[PDB]
Subunit: 118 residues, 3 copies
């Protein structure tokens, strides 16, 4: 019930970097709104570091979606103007993935971790 | 009835700089059209340098609106593509302000300058 | 009925350069589609290097249209964002010209070249 923060730490970095691009709304409004929804769920996943193992496919895909947001945010300053639509579509799909992840059943997650299955 | 040009000089500079960005129409069409409407009014304000004092709040705001146009024009080459909407809104409001100023009653201006009031 | 390739060589260069800008569709979809339609016609014009002389006004304008595509493609990386509409219109007209050229009557061309006229 207490945890050292890693998912939530890596997510707060991505939020603080995205917020800087106020003029570009798919990042600073849409994506940070989704990421701020997802942020408490990352906090309580990190608090459950004992009951969960972060290797399962759901948490590995959480890692990978937050890392796609990270990579996209860090490359934004070099997105050329004629890549706008392209990049926006990419940002939107990151957004959608994060939202679907926010429907994760944590109790079933730690359940499947405490007891073996087929 | 004869004046050394200062409002109109600072406005002609801003016009000649804005005109250069032919591809970007909010500057080179819309803003220079408004500024070319306002330009003769600046000429006759400068010709009246005796009857008016340029310290009153209307002429200080004329100074400040022409200076917002100046600053915006000089920063345009470094407006990034995802700031377009933002910058355009700013340019539009400069435009609107200039137009409203072109309804200034000069006779009431020099009147309030020749005789004291409460 | 066999020819060393020059129109078609200069056109293949322009195609391979335009294709690189995948994100920008007026170039990499629209213009290369038109140019790939025009490409076999350039091949068979080059194969007919004996029966035709490339000096006539139709083939000189083929030269000049392919060279406008070349110049436009090579300058694209320095098209600023607020020139988009402008440049796109230019690209579109190159496109239209190429398409109309693809209605050239080659038989009448080599005919007017084999026999003198007024
Ligand atoms: Ni937060
Ligand atoms: Ni990262
Ligand atoms: Ni003028
Ligand atoms: Ni200034
Ligand atoms: Ni080809
Ligand atoms: Ni060339």
């Amino acid at each position: 019930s207490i945890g050292e923060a890693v998912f939530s730490k890596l997510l707060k970095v991505v939020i603080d970097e995205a917020k800087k691009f106020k003029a570009f709304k798919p990042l600073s409004k849409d994506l940070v709104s989704t990421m701020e929804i997802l942020f408490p769920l990352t906090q309580k996943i990190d608090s459950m570091q004992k009951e969960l193992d972060f290797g399962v496919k759901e948490l590995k895909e959480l890692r990978d979606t937050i890392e796609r947001a990270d990579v996209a945010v860090r490359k934004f300053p070099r997105v050329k103007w004629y890549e706008e639509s392209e990049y926006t579509r990419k940002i939107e799909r990151i957004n959608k993935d994060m939202l679907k992840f926010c429907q994760i059943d944590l109790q079933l997650l730690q359940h499947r971790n405490q007891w073996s299955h087929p």
